[PDB]
RNA sequence: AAUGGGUCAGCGACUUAUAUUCAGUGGCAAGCUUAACCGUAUAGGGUAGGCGUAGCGAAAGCGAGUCUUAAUAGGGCGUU
RNA sequence: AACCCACUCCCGUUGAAAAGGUAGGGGAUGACUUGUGGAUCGGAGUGAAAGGCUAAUCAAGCUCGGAGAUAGCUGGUUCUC
RNA sequence: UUAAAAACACAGCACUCUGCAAACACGAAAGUGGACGUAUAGGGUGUGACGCCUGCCCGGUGCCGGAAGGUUAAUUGAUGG
RNA sequence: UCGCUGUGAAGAUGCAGUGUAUCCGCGGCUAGACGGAAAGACCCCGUGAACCUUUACUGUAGCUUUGCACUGGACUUUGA
RNA sequence: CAUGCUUGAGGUUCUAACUCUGGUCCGUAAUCCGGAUCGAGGACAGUGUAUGGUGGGCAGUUUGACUGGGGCGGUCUCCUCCUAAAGAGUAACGGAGGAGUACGAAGGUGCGCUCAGACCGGUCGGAAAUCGGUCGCAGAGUAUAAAGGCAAAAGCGCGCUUGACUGCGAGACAGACACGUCGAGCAGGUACGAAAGUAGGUCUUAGUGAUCCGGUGGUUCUGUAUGGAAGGGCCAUCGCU
């Protein structure tokens, strides 16, 4: 099925977003830009683990 | 003897001048599948409903 | 028997009828699809809910090609 | 609290907050209450010579509520910004 | 053609204590009231304590404001 | 035969009797019957075993306490406008 | 005190345990029974004079034997944080 | 303190219509008074009770394994 | 290697602890019990404490509801249609079907384009492959049931992209409560477009589980004499056929 993952901001903040992904069809990591409330810009967010 | 307050009711409701405060439910876990708007609107504090005041006040020994 | 199922009703239909006074943000129709189309001064939600963006009264008119039914807001 | 077997409110909502032990020794005084101490001096002991505060209070703050009667001197008692201006207005000073 | 009673006389079932909330009726009033205990013992003393005069916040805290928030924007609660 | 038992019919069933009687019936020197005294008992005793017996009470005796146990169940609840 | 029987017991048969301070049972324990007995004895279990016999299965569950190797308690306290 | 046919909490001495019938005993018989007796034992219900069973759950007497204590000397094998 | 100093484990042996429901002496008039002494066993056995296994021998309990009586069978939450009487709602062990997901593009935006089917002509296919022409108007398609929708197509393709954004939120719909639904507009930063603008996921309606407890990332809160720490609070988020 789809497994819960965690997107950690590339800035120094500890802010993160949560989503799910199909780890069988798409094994490679996600590199997406999302708004970071602490620093107040859009920055690269990188996939990590939820556990 | 003195009336005994319910311990679990006093940990969930606080007495203010506008009524009784409490937090919202459905916010402990299973949060990923929830809309951000829905989680944002369950974040603050709400006053007790009109039809629930009588039962809670009796539990708190306020009436 | 293998039939005893059903789902809970959704309370759809027209909420404000023609000629009623409206305020901004009022819900006019709850819909599946667009039985009615958003006229002047009316917005459409993602579940096709029609809501009032301005103040006035409901009009309800069948105009244009395609024979569509429109709900608009006009000044009283 | 019984509802027939349905989950009741005192078990359906979450617990929140903690109790401040630092506020046990706290008290607040209205500006209208200042003109009740004996003479021209407001201190922790002087408010206990009257019956303004309990005998276990160690910290006192003065908030603007009502008019200040006469000129008084405050001794180690905090006041709000609005309350201080009322106190200085009626000839009273603010030291310690 | 469901229950109870053969009849008479006597007895026989919403009470009391302590904590409270609302209403009526009184005393004082920005203040009201004492508890144990003294006592000339239903008086008088005893104002420790309780409630009220300010709220908001989980809290530090700030205060006619305060919390949320980057925001004196909006919104919640409170204030003549 | 005595004595111990209790297979059948009838009577009796408010009985003469809270388990009998009249007729018949089985054992009757034995794993017999019986007197006096004694030992084992309440989750315990005893039982050639029927869940039988333990003072007319036994799928856990009687008595006094916890005790006014608990009863979302029946019954009742007293003068007048 | 509504069932006397085809039910229980029985002599005979078999399995199994027990080397004596026996197994086993009643006892917080001392102790007592077994037994002032000693494997031709004692306890438990099933079957039930006598005659002819009592066939196949050790996969399950139990019991007995084995001890190599895997797991495995209190205990110990290297190492890291 | 009658019969019949209907009605009716649905099988009537007591209701409706109708028919019969002076008042009161005694000896007999049991068709009815849903006759007397026992707050149905069959059936269902109660977040009732007892006792029994087991590879239901949680425990536990008894039996058993090992560490420490009561608990010592010597020799030998053997790992750090 | 040779020893020294410990210390894990095993075996043998000794007597001196312990044990004897073995003998003979005394207390003593005594098959109890003590003391003495021979004999035997012997650091074993046994008892206390800690711990693993077994343990209906014994104990306290649990073992749902609906139901044309109970039991057996079936059902129990969510979505779509009919029943449902032209606003909403509306029951039956009434009649019919689905769900307990999927997608980093199947989302956003700008630009561009229309299907199914039929007939004629055309090399291996011939009813049906790719092709050219005419008609066709949605009889196609929509990730997934059914219903309601779809030309500004909500259907199809391409380039760039991350708005599947953070804080809110006037006003409503639903509604016993706890929950649920829609949303203009404001502030921050964005993405596509020349621009007006559009974008707070997907044509819509199923794809879900409260509180307690425990874990992980932050935190100008608190922190039992004080400074810290442990613990607690707040925000985010994980673990329930
Ligand atoms: Mg408490
Ligand atoms: Mg949730
Ligand atoms: Mg949390
Ligand atoms: Mg059905
Ligand atoms: Mg329905
Ligand atoms: Mg419906
Ligand atoms: Mg929109
Ligand atoms: Mg005081
Ligand atoms: Mg009668
Ligand atoms: Mg009856
Ligand atoms: Mg009845
Ligand atoms: Mg009655
Ligand atoms: Mg009667
Ligand atoms: Mg008054
Ligand atoms: Mg405000
Ligand atoms: Mg207000
Ligand atoms: Mg005799
Ligand atoms: Mg005869
Ligand atoms: Mg006879
Ligand atoms: Mg005879
Ligand atoms: Mg004979
Ligand atoms: Mg004798
Ligand atoms: Mg006795
Ligand atoms: Mg008993
Ligand atoms: Mg039986
Ligand atoms: Mg007796
Ligand atoms: Mg008896
Ligand atoms: Mg009691
Ligand atoms: Mg009673
Ligand atoms: Mg009754
Ligand atoms: Mg016989
Ligand atoms: Mg008999
Ligand atoms: Mg028998
Ligand atoms: Mg034998
Ligand atoms: Mg037999
Ligand atoms: Mg036989
Ligand atoms: Mg084998
Ligand atoms: Mg076997
Ligand atoms: Mg073995
Ligand atoms: Mg007559
Ligand atoms: Mg009739
Ligand atoms: Mg009749
Ligand atoms: Mg009558
Ligand atoms: Mg009549
Ligand atoms: Mg009449
Ligand atoms: Mg007669
Ligand atoms: Mg007779
Ligand atoms: Mg009769
Ligand atoms: Mg009767
Ligand atoms: Mg009764
Ligand atoms: Mg009854
Ligand atoms: Mg029965
Ligand atoms: Mg139950
Ligand atoms: Mg119940
Ligand atoms: Mg012995
Ligand atoms: Mg001796
Ligand atoms: Mg010796
Ligand atoms: Mg030993
Ligand atoms: Mg040992
Ligand atoms: Mg031991
Ligand atoms: Mg031991
Ligand atoms: Mg059992
Ligand atoms: Mg049991
Ligand atoms: Mg068990
Ligand atoms: Mg048992
Ligand atoms: Mg109990
Ligand atoms: Mg039970
Ligand atoms: Mg249960
Ligand atoms: Mg039932
Ligand atoms: Mg049925
Ligand atoms: Mg029926
Ligand atoms: Mg069933
Ligand atoms: Mg309708
Ligand atoms: Mg209608
Ligand atoms: Mg209904
Ligand atoms: Mg289904
Ligand atoms: Mg699509
Ligand atoms: Mg359709
Ligand atoms: Mg077009
Ligand atoms: Mg409404
Ligand atoms: Mg641009
Ligand atoms: Mg722009
Ligand atoms: Mg729990
Ligand atoms: Mg400290
Ligand atoms: Mg901390």
UniProtKB/Swiss-Prot annotation, chain A:
<comment type="subunit">
    <text>Part of the 50S ribosomal subunit. Cross-links to the P and E site tRNAs.</text>
</comment>
<dbReference type="Pfam" id="PF00471">
    <property type="entry name" value="Ribosomal_L33"/>
</dbReference>
<dbReference type="InterPro" id="IPR018264">
    <property type="entry name" value="Ribosomal_bL33_CS"/>
</dbReference>
<keyword id="KW-0694">RNA-binding</keyword>
<dbReference type="InterPro" id="IPR011332">
    <property type="entry name" value="Ribosomal_zn-bd"/>
</dbReference>
<dbReference type="GO" id="GO:0003735">
    <property type="term" value="F:structural constituent of ribosome"/>
</dbReference>
<keyword id="KW-0820">tRNA-binding</keyword>
<dbReference type="GO" id="GO:0022625">
    <property type="term" value="C:cytosolic large ribosomal subunit"/>
</dbReference>
<comment type="similarity">
    <text>Belongs to the bacterial ribosomal protein bL33 family.</text>
</comment>
<dbReference type="InterPro" id="IPR038584">
    <property type="entry name" value="Ribosomal_bL33_sf"/>
</dbReference>
<dbReference type="GO" id="GO:0000049">
    <property type="term" value="F:tRNA binding"/>
</dbReference>
<dbReference type="GO" id="GO:0006412">
    <property type="term" value="P:translation"/>
</dbReference>
Swiss-Prot record, chain B:
<feature type="compositionally biased region" description="Basic residues">
    <location>
        <begin position="1"/>
        <end position="27"/>
    </location>
</feature>
<feature type="region of interest" description="Disordered">
    <location>
        <begin position="1"/>
        <end position="63"/>
    </location>
</feature>
<dbReference type="GO" id="GO:0006412">
    <property type="term" value="P:translation"/>
</dbReference>
<dbReference type="InterPro" id="IPR018265">
    <property type="entry name" value="Ribosomal_bL35_CS"/>
</dbReference>
<dbReference type="InterPro" id="IPR001706">
    <property type="entry name" value="Ribosomal_bL35"/>
</dbReference>
<dbReference type="GO" id="GO:0003735">
    <property type="term" value="F:structural constituent of ribosome"/>
</dbReference>
<keyword id="KW-0689">Ribosomal protein</keyword>
<dbReference type="Pfam" id="PF01632">
    <property type="entry name" value="Ribosomal_L35p"/>
</dbReference>
<keyword id="KW-0687">Ribonucleoprotein</keyword>
<dbReference type="InterPro" id="IPR037229">
    <property type="entry name" value="Ribosomal_bL35_sf"/>
</dbReference>
<dbReference type="GO" id="GO:0022625">
    <property type="term" value="C:cytosolic large ribosomal subunit"/>
</dbReference>
<protein>
    <recommendedName>
        <fullName>Large ribosomal subunit protein bL35</fullName>
    </recommendedName>
</protein>
UniProtKB/Swiss-Prot annotation, chain C:
<dbReference type="GO" id="GO:0003735">
    <property type="term" value="F:structural constituent of ribosome"/>
</dbReference>
<dbReference type="GO" id="GO:0022625">
    <property type="term" value="C:cytosolic large ribosomal subunit"/>
</dbReference>
<keyword id="KW-0687">Ribonucleoprotein</keyword>
<dbReference type="InterPro" id="IPR018261">
    <property type="entry name" value="Ribosomal_bL27_CS"/>
</dbReference>
<keyword id="KW-0689">Ribosomal protein</keyword>
<comment type="similarity">
    <text>Belongs to the bacterial ribosomal protein bL27 family.</text>
</comment>
<dbReference type="InterPro" id="IPR001684">
    <property type="entry name" value="Ribosomal_bL27"/>
</dbReference>
<dbReference type="GO" id="GO:0006412">
    <property type="term" value="P:translation"/>
</dbReference>
<dbReference type="Pfam" id="PF01016">
    <property type="entry name" value="Ribosomal_L27"/>
</dbReference>
<protein>
    <recommendedName>
        <fullName>Large ribosomal subunit protein bL27</fullName>
    </recommendedName>
</protein>
Swiss-Prot record, chain D:
<dbReference type="GO" id="GO:0019843">
    <property type="term" value="F:rRNA binding"/>
</dbReference>
<protein>
    <recommendedName>
        <fullName>Large ribosomal subunit protein uL15</fullName>
    </recommendedName>
</protein>
<keyword id="KW-0699">rRNA-binding</keyword>
<comment type="similarity">
    <text>Belongs to the universal ribosomal protein uL15 family.</text>
</comment>
<keyword id="KW-0687">Ribonucleoprotein</keyword>
<dbReference type="GO" id="GO:0003735">
    <property type="term" value="F:structural constituent of ribosome"/>
</dbReference>
<dbReference type="GO" id="GO:0006412">
    <property type="term" value="P:translation"/>
</dbReference>
<keyword id="KW-0689">Ribosomal protein</keyword>
<keyword id="KW-0694">RNA-binding</keyword>
<comment type="function">
    <text>Binds to the 23S rRNA.</text>
</comment>
<dbReference type="GO" id="GO:0022625">
    <property type="term" value="C:cytosolic large ribosomal subunit"/>
</dbReference>
<comment type="subunit">
    <text>Part of the 50S ribosomal subunit.</text>
</comment>
């Amino acid at each position: 099925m789809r497994e819960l993952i965690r997107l950690v901001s590339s800035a120094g903040t500890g802010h993160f977003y949560t989503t799910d992904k199909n780890k069988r069809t798409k094994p490679e990591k996600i590199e997406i830009k999302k708004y970071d409330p602490v620093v107040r810009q859009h920055v690269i967010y990188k996939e990590a683990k939820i556990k | 003897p003195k009336m005994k307050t319910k311990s679990g009711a006093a940990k969930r409701f606080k007495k203010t001048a506008g009524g009784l405060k409490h937090k919202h439910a459905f916010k402990s876990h299973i949060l990923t599948k929830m809309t951000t708007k829905r989680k944002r609107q369950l974040r603050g504090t709400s006053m007790l409903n009109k039809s629930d005041v009588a039962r809670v006040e009796r539990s708190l020994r306020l009436r | 028997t293998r039939n005893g199922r059903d789902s809970e009703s959704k309370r759809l239909g027209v909420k404000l009828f023609g000629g009623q006074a409206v305020k901004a943000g009022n819900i006019l129709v709850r819909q599946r699809g667009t039985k009615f189309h958003a006229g002047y001064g009316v917005g459409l939600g993602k579940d096709h809910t029609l809501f009032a963006k301005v103040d006035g009264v409901v009009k309800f008119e069948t105009k244009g090609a395609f024979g569509r039914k429109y709900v608009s807001i006009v000044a009283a | 609290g019984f509802e027939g077997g349905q989950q009741p409110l005192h078990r359906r909502l979450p617990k929140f907050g903690f109790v401040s032990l630092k506020a046990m020794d706290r008290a607040e005084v209205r500006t209208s209450e200042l003109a009740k101490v004996e003479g021209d001096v407001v201190s922790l002991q002087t408010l206990k010579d009257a019956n303004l505060i309990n005998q276990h209070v160690q910290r006192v703050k003065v908030m603007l509520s009502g008019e200040v009667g006469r000129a008084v001197t405050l001794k180690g008692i905090a006041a709000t910004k609005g309350a201080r201006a009322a106190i200085e207005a009626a000839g009273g000073k603010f030291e310690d």
